[PDB]
Amino acid sequence: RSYQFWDTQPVPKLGEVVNTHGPVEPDKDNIRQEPYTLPQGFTWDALDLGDRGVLKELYTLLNENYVEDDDNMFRFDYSPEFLLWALRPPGWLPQWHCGVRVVSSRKLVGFISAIPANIHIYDTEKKMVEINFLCVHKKLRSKRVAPVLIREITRRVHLEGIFQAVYTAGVVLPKPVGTCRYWHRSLNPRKLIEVKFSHLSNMTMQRTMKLYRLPETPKTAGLRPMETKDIPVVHQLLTRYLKQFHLTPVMSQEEVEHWFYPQENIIDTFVVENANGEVTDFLSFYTLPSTIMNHKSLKAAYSFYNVHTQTPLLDLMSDALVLAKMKGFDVFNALDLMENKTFLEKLKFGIGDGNLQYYLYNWKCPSMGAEKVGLVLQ
């Protein structure tokens, strides 16, 4: 490949091997004030998701034009309540919900977002932003709109004093700090084969169903949904557990509440409260269904953060599978980052299509194995 756009950006190129730790370019003393030029007929807009109609426009745009699998069958079916959870964490800005509209139609045909986050990369803690939901209407993809969306959100982030960012992609760009791989655990194998999420391996439908059968209830003592009183100890257990990885978020107790307090059809968090009344472990997974292109929806649970101090991680993730099975999910998704490679194969996960490349904008540092990534984005 040739990277016309990323060669102009403060990122190292692919062939480069990094042995340093630091920014590529300095913090900017003066930042460009006017927005970048969009092609004629389109204008910028900051999306106030507090408007149910504006939020309605966004998920309609995403669920019709956002990322699909390699085979054109499944499109992420984002919920209005889900997007509020992902795009309104502590410190969010409406200007960082960067939208593009047709000038005459006022139709939403492009979007990119940024949320603030404290990132711990190796031995440095930096105030960065998390970029997500870069989406261009398929009719518009011919006018080079994506590079403009990146430069505009970069400008709007610079105006607030932030000069680093973390983001993911399924494509290889300059230059991945870490490469993870998706794994899938079938919870409802009948339907996954129906809609061709998976294929019958020679095994009958009866043999496949028996292999993926799960107990009706979890096995761990003191397992219960997280509630308000668990917020500090969940925050405490998460900060200590993340210190072993090299790329992690540094959450405040306010951010821990946002990302982990249970919300129906959005985020689920179960804590382990032992016989002495102490919370010693917790599991979490968020909800993200996919639109089935032909003959209607695929309920998928995505592993989030799973912290263990007294329960084995294998036992904890078995309960996550049981819980997700109970709640009606059809598949339990999890990356191979953090300690996930210790249970993926044992708990009958299957390796998936393609990777999730992790990237740092304006930060030069060595790469790390997937086992060292402690960051999960929405």
Partner: peptide
Amino acid sequence: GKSNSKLK
């Protein structure tokens, strides 16, 4: 952006 993976 997140990628949509499927069992290979």
